[PDB]
Amino acid sequence: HEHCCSEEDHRIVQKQWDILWRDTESSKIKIGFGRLLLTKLAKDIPEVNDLFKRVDIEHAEGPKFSAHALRILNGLDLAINLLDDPPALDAALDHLAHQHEVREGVQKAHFKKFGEILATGLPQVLDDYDALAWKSCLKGILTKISSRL
């Protein structure tokens, strides 16, 4: 239970997640990627479309949503970049829990799915992907984030 997402584990994740932000046009990427990630979520579970209604998910390319795409995708960044400081990461995530707690409609099963999606997506943009390491870490993150619903 304590061997999940270990130093080496995340040291890896971190390294691999960086292959992404090598070029200055991170925005275009983060957006496109996050956009797709959320879309593919609403695809498999529609009751989501209503949750992201507030951010005009109806218009994927709409700034309203594009901004959102960043915020989330960028939050995942924060999570990953704090992997090497458990107490901080903890706090950082707990905070994310609360930001999701007051958003009724969002249930655990959503994250479980988003996780599966994220796990099938990453390896499509990263040539070097270590499924084992990632799954280990993503789990810890996604869980702590939804631990309030």
Binding site: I19, R22, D23, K28, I29, G32, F33, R35, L36, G121, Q124, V125, D127, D128
Partner: protein
Amino acid sequence: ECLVTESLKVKLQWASAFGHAHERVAFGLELWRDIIDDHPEIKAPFSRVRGDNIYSPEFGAHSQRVLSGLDITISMLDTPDMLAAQLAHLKVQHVERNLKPEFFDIFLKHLLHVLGDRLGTHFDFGAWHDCVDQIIDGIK
């Protein structure tokens, strides 16, 4: 079909593979050599750019010009309006010559073979095939 990620993947890998400065000429050369050895029929239209001697500066120049265009197209995979236009523009610079549409199918075969070496096992064949293909058909 080249969606959003399948592109970024190529856009990214192209970076590492292609490279900068001399690293490129090397790439171009290696590429065309493999192509011409497989189908010497091509040395024909490349008569204007000394295709007989691929190591020559005349051809070297050409080689580069080519790869460059390829760079452009690849850097436009995300924006359709520009690609569709750019591709159409390239088709013209080619159609004006006896070019067996199969030549491109060949070019592609090697471009992948080469990137394969350069990138190794990480090379996302799928993404490239689906993506570079679309670029060829727009010129074929």
